[PDB]
Amino acid sequence: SWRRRDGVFLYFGVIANPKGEMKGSAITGPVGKECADLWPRVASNSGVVV
Amino acid sequence: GHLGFLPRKRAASIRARVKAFPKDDRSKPVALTSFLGYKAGMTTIVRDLDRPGSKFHKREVVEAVTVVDTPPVVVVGVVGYVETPRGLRSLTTVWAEHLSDEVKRRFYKNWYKSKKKAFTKYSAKYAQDGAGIERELARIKKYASVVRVLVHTQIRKTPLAQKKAHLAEIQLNGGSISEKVDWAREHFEKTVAVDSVFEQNEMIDAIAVTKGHGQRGYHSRTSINHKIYRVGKGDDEANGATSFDRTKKTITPMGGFVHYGEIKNDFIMVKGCIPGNRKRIVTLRKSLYTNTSRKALEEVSLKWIDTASKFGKGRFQTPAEKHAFMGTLKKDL
Amino acid sequence: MQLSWKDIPTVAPANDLLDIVLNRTQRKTPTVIRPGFKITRIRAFYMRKVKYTGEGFVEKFEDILKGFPNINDVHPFHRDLMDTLYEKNHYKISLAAISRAKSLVEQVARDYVRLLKFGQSLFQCKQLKRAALGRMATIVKKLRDPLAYLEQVRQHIGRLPSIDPNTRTLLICGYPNVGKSSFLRCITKSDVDVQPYAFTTKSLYVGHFDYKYLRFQAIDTPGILMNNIEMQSIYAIAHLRSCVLYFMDLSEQCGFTIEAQVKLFHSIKPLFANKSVMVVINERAQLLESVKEVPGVEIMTSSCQLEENVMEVRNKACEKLLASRTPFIPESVKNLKKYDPEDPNRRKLARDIEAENGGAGVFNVNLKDKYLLEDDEWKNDIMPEILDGKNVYDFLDPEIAAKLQALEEEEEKLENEGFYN
Amino acid sequence: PQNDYIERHIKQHGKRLDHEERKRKREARESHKISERAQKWKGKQFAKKRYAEKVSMRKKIKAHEQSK
RNA sequence: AGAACUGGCGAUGCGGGAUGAACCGAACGUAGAGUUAAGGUGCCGGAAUACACGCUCAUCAGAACAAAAGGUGUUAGUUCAUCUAGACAGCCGGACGGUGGCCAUGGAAGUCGGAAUCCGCUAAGGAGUGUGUAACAACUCACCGGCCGAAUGAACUA
RNA sequence: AGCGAAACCACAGCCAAGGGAACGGGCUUGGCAGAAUCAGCGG
RNA sequence: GCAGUCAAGCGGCGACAUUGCUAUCAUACCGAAGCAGAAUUCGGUAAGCGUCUACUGAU
RNA sequence: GGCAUUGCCGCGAAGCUACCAUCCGCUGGAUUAUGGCUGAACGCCUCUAAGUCAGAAUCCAUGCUAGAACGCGGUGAU
């Protein structure tokens, strides 16, 4: 797991173009803050945040 | 790795010697350059990040915080130093004629077998009408340009199973060294509050002997930016009650500290860990400089301190919370 | 590469390139050896030195060759344009000579390495290395003229305003100093003048402009009166997918009279008619009307100061090229005047206030008075948010005293009832 | 971008307010710089270059002296 | 590698080259008195920090090889010219006419290219040594006039 | 706790330079540093 | 290497140029490039960090 | 559950312990190359020969480590 600034731990290969857009329109899965926030483009293409 | 801490040889004394000190202050009055205490342990702190431009601005942040026991320091003497081509030299020293037993015991290793007939000829001479004693002060004032004040810890207030104290020479930076010596004499046998030496958000640094991994460790170490979070007082109840949560409690973990007595005196919270370990004396200094940056300029926003027991796991923070949630038991009504 | 070139590596003169390679091989390679060392070690030392020198020379030659574009295979329009800026045959010959020199250097290096693999004396290896280096320098030294020509071509081509032929482009043609010089400047940003000398525009200036939310650009012909400049201009007007326009003057500019201008204009008859020609003019009526024999053209008198005429002509050219429930709003928001940055009395944004006081992002965020709270007397909060192991947020409600009153008496009810028996 | 961009800038704004003076001073320092470098493997190259320049200048002067 | 000749070591002390087989003096009984050689004279080291000429500041001077060159580094000389008809430099001024000397170019009037450089006149001048011109123009480089007051300008040699 | 060898030993060790086949360890020029005394890098 | 206009000295040779194939990779105070800007290479500087003797713990 | 020189299922603080967890990790000068001033030498000129400003991640200062086990100083005891 990894430490979060909120004060609690959290735990549960794909590549994209230079803009971070994935080859899909209905991406789903454990899209944590490491991707939902780091990759805003992917976050819009991904439904299940965290 | 680093060859600056090699050879891996144990230090000479447990107490960490302070080498450097600030230079001088042309206008401000006499002030203490450093403070000393004992490491009570470590806990956790949570606050809100007011640091500007932070990715986690106004978001909760958790970091380990060390608790240092800092009983009111007491002054028992003053040492005068004169500049020489060989460096600073202590030409003269003086006492206050009322050395506490904690200090007199430090001058012995068999206090039980010792006759305890120390500080008698000088104390009796010091008991005279000043004339003889004032000569040393006048000589120091005439020539000395840097003055150090001898201080020791009030071990009696701490829960440590030790009666002997330790003597530490603390320098001053106020100008007009005559004012320095006058202030030192006026404070003989008197104590100095913790708040009067350091304040909240100060970017102080501390030096102490690290834990011996056994010859690894046990050496003197230093690290700057040991920011003090919040200074607490044993007499001021609700020290553990932060500004935000303000829960009526104390920083002492439930069931006391791990292999250490309960904290019931003045204490200071410092960001991050600190060298040494519990039951070890530590020293605090202002880093000899000013760390001009927005990290220092920010203010403390403490919200909660981890005060759960360290024996096994922990489900409660204070006894008042345990009885309500757990209710009665066999050993109760 | 595309039709624009600005990344070509600098062409190092033979002497400069030779010196650079010599420095590289001398510094990077080892330089200390003695006869008492292992013979195999000395053989490896010499072989490594020779191979490194040869590889450096070959890599430099390849990098120089690759940077230059292939004139023949770039584009017929650009090929013809470069055929007038530079001698195309000489360009190809120089490229072939450089390639042959690189191949010869590679062959020499390989042959020397093969021979050096079976050396019998240290001095023999030293002599072989000296001969190889001398041959490489001599071969490189002879490229002074082709290398200088390549450097000049690279310098000249590193700033040309080349554009794709397919892009909508406007071509302006006419005699030198006709007055069309100001045409390009008015239509597009350029630094040209109508100074009273013939060739005020020596190069083929290009400038972009927009109309009807569609990108456009114009090209000014340096001058047409064979002439090198005239041939270069023709070899770009003919091949470019643009509209060709002609300009004229009565007696002051361009020197030549109306009759001479008309005669020159009629000389471009074989190829100009296919690009929707238009004419702007800065017994004489008959000569001007002679342009009507073209399948289609428009002629209008104007002047260098007639900016509106220039704009109308540009719009006409662009048109010819192209041819070929009710909402709900908080009226209060829109009532306030729109932001006016130039107004000192405007509603200064937080950016300006922070820059004046907080500077850059180094400032800290604050919410004082931001909340829409009724009373300002208590615009400061220290929320408990935790009490007795319970969240205060689960108890903060308006006047909960009413609910607490109904529970107050339950203590007395339990006490007198006697649940403890 | 343009065929004479830097040329246009130079012709429109000239050079620095003291470019001519700076260039003249730098050229004046060349004599001192050459002598200083001659006394400070690079030495072999410097000596060879200086000797080649001297030989070329002397040959050019002598060949053209035949005109008088 | 083969090999003709003469000296030391071979079997050779001792003084000196701080350090040593290839060096210099000197070959030998134990001793007292004085003078030398190599080698030395600021100290370790026993002997003058002696006398006179100048040389050199090395960013590691000085106490068998790359040695052909560079220095607007320095200390002294040979040769060729100018030179009180006014040395060099420093300044002011002249620096011209046919001329835009012949050829194409959009243009080239001396300085983007090809080749002659005609020639009047003056104290003095190239159809031009460069900066510079789109094409002119202006400054100017060698060449000359005025102020200045004497020895100077160039190449080599130790 | 008590008994109790052997290998080896001209003598043996603080280093840098010179020392010719270079062996420097006992010659010269300089710099080091403690009677006594556990324990070893993977030398 | 072959022949040569090649020529300071100089007992018939001769360094000098030209005519035929066959101690940094980044970390830069600094300057150049036809460097509009980023980027770029070049001469620049630094090896700083990048890419039986001895004690490592001791009396 | 009387035994596994040391038991299995479910747990376990502490010793140990790592982003496998946490905090921290310097402020002033002299200079190399280089850009200038004054100023000659060589009546000119020039960055240098007299001095000087800016300027190296270089060097020294700041700080940290150990402290000559025969470097030193001050003090309570006879």
Coordinates of N, CA and C in Angstrom, one line a residue, chain C residues 263-368:
Chain C
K263 N 2.4 45.3 -73.0 CA 3.2 44.4 -73.8 C 3.8 43.3 -73.0
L264 N 4.4 43.7 -71.8 CA 5.0 42.7 -70.9 C 3.9 41.8 -70.4
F265 N 2.7 42.3 -70.0 CA 1.7 41.5 -69.5 C 1.2 40.5 -70.5
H266 N 1.1 40.9 -71.8 CA 0.7 39.9 -72.8 C 1.7 38.8 -73.0
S267 N 2.9 39.0 -72.5 CA 4.0 38.0 -72.7 C 3.7 36.8 -71.8
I268 N 3.0 37.0 -70.7 CA 2.7 35.9 -69.8 C 1.4 35.2 -70.2
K269 N 1.0 35.4 -71.4 CA -0.3 34.8 -71.9 C -0.3 33.3 -71.8
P270 N 0.8 32.5 -72.2 CA 0.6 31.1 -72.3 C 0.2 30.4 -71.1
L271 N 0.5 30.9 -69.9 CA 0.3 30.1 -68.6 C -0.5 30.9 -67.6
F272 N -0.6 32.2 -67.6 CA -1.3 32.9 -66.6 C -2.8 32.8 -66.6
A273 N -3.4 32.4 -67.7 CA -4.8 32.5 -67.8 C -5.5 31.4 -67.0
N274 N -4.8 30.4 -66.5 CA -5.4 29.3 -65.8 C -5.6 29.6 -64.3
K275 N -5.3 30.8 -63.8 CA -5.3 31.0 -62.3 C -6.1 32.2 -62.0
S276 N -7.3 32.4 -62.6 CA -8.3 33.4 -62.3 C -7.6 34.7 -62.1
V277 N -7.1 35.2 -63.2 CA -6.3 36.5 -63.1 C -7.1 37.7 -62.8
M278 N -6.6 38.6 -62.1 CA -7.2 39.9 -61.8 C -6.1 41.0 -61.9
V279 N -6.5 42.2 -62.3 CA -5.6 43.3 -62.5 C -6.0 44.5 -61.7
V280 N -5.0 45.2 -61.1 CA -5.3 46.4 -60.4 C -4.3 47.4 -61.0
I281 N -4.8 48.6 -61.4 CA -4.0 49.7 -62.0 C -3.8 50.8 -61.0
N282 N -2.5 51.1 -60.8 CA -2.2 52.2 -59.8 C -2.4 53.6 -60.5
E283 N -6.8 57.5 -75.4 CA -6.1 56.4 -76.1 C -5.6 55.4 -75.1
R284 N -5.2 55.8 -73.9 CA -4.7 54.9 -72.9 C -5.8 53.9 -72.5
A285 N -7.1 54.3 -72.6 CA -8.1 53.4 -72.2 C -8.1 52.1 -73.1
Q286 N -7.9 52.3 -74.4 CA -7.9 51.1 -75.3 C -6.8 50.1 -74.9
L287 N -5.6 50.6 -74.5 CA -4.6 49.7 -74.1 C -5.0 49.0 -72.8
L288 N -5.5 49.7 -71.8 CA -6.0 49.0 -70.6 C -7.1 48.0 -70.9
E289 N -8.0 48.4 -71.8 CA -9.1 47.5 -72.2 C -8.7 46.3 -73.0
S290 N -7.4 46.3 -73.5 CA -6.9 45.2 -74.2 C -6.8 43.9 -73.3
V291 N -6.7 44.1 -72.0 CA -6.6 43.0 -71.1 C -7.9 42.2 -71.1
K292 N -9.0 42.7 -71.6 CA -10.3 42.0 -71.6 C -10.3 40.8 -72.5
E293 N -9.3 40.7 -73.4 CA -9.2 39.6 -74.3 C -8.9 38.3 -73.6
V294 N -8.5 38.4 -72.3 CA -8.3 37.2 -71.5 C -9.6 36.5 -71.2
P295 N -9.7 35.2 -71.0 CA -11.0 34.6 -70.7 C -11.7 35.2 -69.6
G296 N -11.0 35.7 -68.5 CA -11.7 36.4 -67.4 C -10.7 37.2 -66.6
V297 N -11.0 38.5 -66.4 CA -10.1 39.4 -65.6 C -11.0 40.6 -65.2
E298 N -10.5 41.3 -64.1 CA -11.1 42.5 -63.7 C -10.0 43.5 -63.5
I299 N -10.3 44.7 -64.1 CA -9.4 45.8 -64.1 C -10.0 47.0 -63.4
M300 N -9.3 47.6 -62.4 CA -9.8 48.8 -61.7 C -8.7 49.7 -61.4
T301 N -8.9 51.0 -61.6 CA -7.9 52.0 -61.3 C -7.8 52.3 -59.8
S302 N -6.6 52.5 -59.2 CA -6.5 52.7 -57.8 C -5.1 53.4 -57.6
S303 N -4.7 53.4 -56.3 CA -3.5 54.0 -55.9 C -2.9 53.3 -54.7
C304 N -1.6 53.5 -54.5 CA -0.9 52.8 -53.3 C -1.6 53.2 -52.0
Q305 N -2.2 54.4 -51.9 CA -2.9 54.8 -50.7 C -4.4 54.4 -50.7
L306 N -4.9 53.7 -51.7 CA -6.3 53.3 -51.8 C -6.4 51.9 -51.0
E307 N -6.3 52.0 -49.7 CA -6.4 50.8 -48.9 C -7.7 50.0 -49.1
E308 N -8.8 50.8 -49.2 CA -10.1 50.1 -49.3 C -10.2 49.4 -50.6
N309 N -9.6 49.9 -51.7 CA -9.5 49.1 -52.9 C -8.8 47.8 -52.8
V310 N -7.6 47.9 -52.1 CA -6.9 46.7 -51.8 C -7.7 45.7 -51.1
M311 N -8.4 46.1 -50.0 CA -9.2 45.2 -49.2 C -10.3 44.6 -50.1
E312 N -11.0 45.4 -51.0 CA -12.0 44.9 -51.8 C -11.4 43.9 -52.8
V313 N -10.3 44.1 -53.4 CA -9.6 43.2 -54.3 C -9.3 41.9 -53.6
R314 N -8.8 42.0 -52.3 CA -8.5 40.8 -51.6 C -9.8 40.0 -51.3
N315 N -10.9 40.6 -50.9 CA -12.1 40.0 -50.7 C -12.6 39.3 -51.9
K316 N -12.5 40.0 -53.1 CA -13.0 39.4 -54.3 C -12.2 38.1 -54.7
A317 N -10.8 38.2 -54.5 CA -10.0 37.1 -54.8 C -10.3 35.9 -53.8
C318 N -10.6 36.2 -52.6 CA -10.9 35.1 -51.6 C -12.3 34.5 -52.0
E319 N -13.2 35.3 -52.4 CA -14.5 34.8 -52.9 C -14.4 33.9 -54.1
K320 N -13.5 34.4 -55.1 CA -13.3 33.6 -56.3 C -12.6 32.2 -55.9
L321 N -11.7 32.3 -55.0 CA -11.0 31.0 -54.6 C -12.0 30.1 -54.0
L322 N -12.8 30.6 -53.1 CA -13.8 29.8 -52.4 C -14.8 29.2 -53.4
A323 N -15.2 29.9 -54.4 CA -16.2 29.4 -55.4 C -15.6 28.3 -56.2
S324 N -14.3 28.3 -56.5 CA -13.7 27.3 -57.3 C -13.6 26.0 -56.4
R325 N -35.3 26.8 -27.0 CA -36.2 27.9 -26.7 C -35.4 29.1 -26.1
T326 N -36.1 30.1 -25.6 CA -35.5 31.3 -25.1 C -34.7 30.9 -23.8
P327 N -33.5 31.4 -23.5 CA -32.8 31.0 -22.4 C -33.2 31.8 -21.1
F328 N -32.7 31.4 -20.0 CA -32.9 32.1 -18.7 C -31.5 32.5 -18.2
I329 N -31.4 33.8 -17.8 CA -30.2 34.3 -17.3 C -30.4 35.1 -16.1
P330 N -29.4 35.1 -15.1 CA -29.5 36.1 -14.0 C -29.2 37.5 -14.4
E331 N -30.2 38.2 -14.9 CA -30.0 39.5 -15.5 C -29.0 40.4 -14.7
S332 N -29.0 40.2 -13.4 CA -28.0 41.0 -12.6 C -26.6 40.8 -13.0
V333 N -26.2 39.5 -13.4 CA -24.8 39.3 -13.8 C -24.5 40.1 -15.1
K334 N -25.4 40.0 -16.1 CA -25.1 40.7 -17.3 C -25.3 42.2 -17.3
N335 N -26.1 42.7 -16.3 CA -26.2 44.1 -16.1 C -24.9 44.8 -15.9
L336 N -24.0 44.2 -15.0 CA -22.7 44.8 -14.8 C -21.9 44.9 -16.1
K337 N -21.2 46.0 -16.2 CA -20.4 46.2 -17.4 C -19.3 45.1 -17.6
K338 N -19.1 44.7 -18.8 CA -18.1 43.7 -19.1 C -16.7 44.1 -18.7
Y339 N -15.9 43.2 -18.4 CA -14.5 43.5 -17.9 C -13.8 44.3 -19.0
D340 N -13.2 45.4 -18.5 CA -12.4 46.3 -19.3 C -11.0 46.4 -18.7
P341 N -10.1 45.6 -19.2 CA -8.7 45.7 -18.6 C -8.1 47.0 -18.7
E342 N -8.3 47.8 -19.7 CA -7.7 49.1 -19.8 C -8.2 50.1 -18.8
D343 N -9.4 49.9 -18.2 CA -10.0 50.8 -17.3 C -9.4 50.7 -16.0
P344 N -8.8 51.8 -15.4 CA -8.2 51.7 -14.1 C -9.2 51.5 -13.0
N345 N -10.5 51.8 -13.2 CA -11.5 51.7 -12.2 C -12.3 50.3 -12.3
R346 N -11.8 49.4 -13.2 CA -12.5 48.2 -13.4 C -12.4 47.4 -12.1
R347 N -13.2 46.3 -12.1 CA -13.2 45.3 -10.9 C -11.9 44.5 -11.0
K348 N -10.9 45.0 -10.4 CA -9.6 44.3 -10.5 C -9.7 42.8 -10.1
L349 N -9.1 41.9 -10.9 CA -9.2 40.5 -10.6 C -8.2 40.2 -9.5
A350 N -8.4 39.0 -8.9 CA -7.6 38.5 -7.8 C -6.1 38.5 -8.3
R351 N -5.9 38.2 -9.5 CA -4.5 38.1 -10.1 C -3.8 39.4 -9.9
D352 N -4.4 40.5 -10.3 CA -3.8 41.8 -10.1 C -3.5 42.2 -8.7
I353 N -4.5 41.9 -7.8 CA -4.3 42.2 -6.4 C -3.2 41.4 -5.8
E354 N -3.1 40.1 -6.1 CA -2.1 39.3 -5.6 C -0.7 39.7 -6.1
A355 N -0.6 40.1 -7.4 CA 0.6 40.6 -8.0 C 1.1 41.8 -7.3
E356 N 0.1 42.7 -7.0 CA 0.5 44.0 -6.3 C 1.0 43.7 -4.9
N357 N 0.3 42.8 -4.2 CA 0.6 42.5 -2.8 C 1.2 41.1 -2.6
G358 N 0.5 40.1 -3.1 CA 1.0 38.7 -2.9 C 2.0 38.2 -3.9
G359 N 2.3 39.0 -4.9 CA 3.2 38.6 -5.9 C 2.7 37.4 -6.7
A360 N 3.6 36.4 -7.0 CA 3.3 35.2 -7.7 C 2.5 34.3 -6.8
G361 N 2.4 33.0 -7.3 CA 1.6 32.0 -6.5 C 2.1 31.8 -5.1
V362 N 3.3 32.4 -4.8 CA 3.8 32.4 -3.4 C 2.8 32.9 -2.4
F363 N 1.7 33.6 -2.8 CA 0.7 34.0 -1.9 C -0.1 32.8 -1.4
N364 N -0.8 33.1 -0.2 CA -1.5 32.0 0.4 C -3.0 32.3 0.3
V365 N -3.8 31.3 0.1 CA -5.3 31.4 -0.1 C -5.9 31.7 1.3
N366 N -6.9 32.6 1.2 CA -7.7 33.0 2.4 C -9.2 33.1 2.0
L367 N -10.0 32.8 3.0 CA -11.5 32.8 2.8 C -12.2 33.8 3.7
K368 N -11.5 34.8 4.2 CA -12.1 35.7 5.1 C -13.2 36.5 4.4

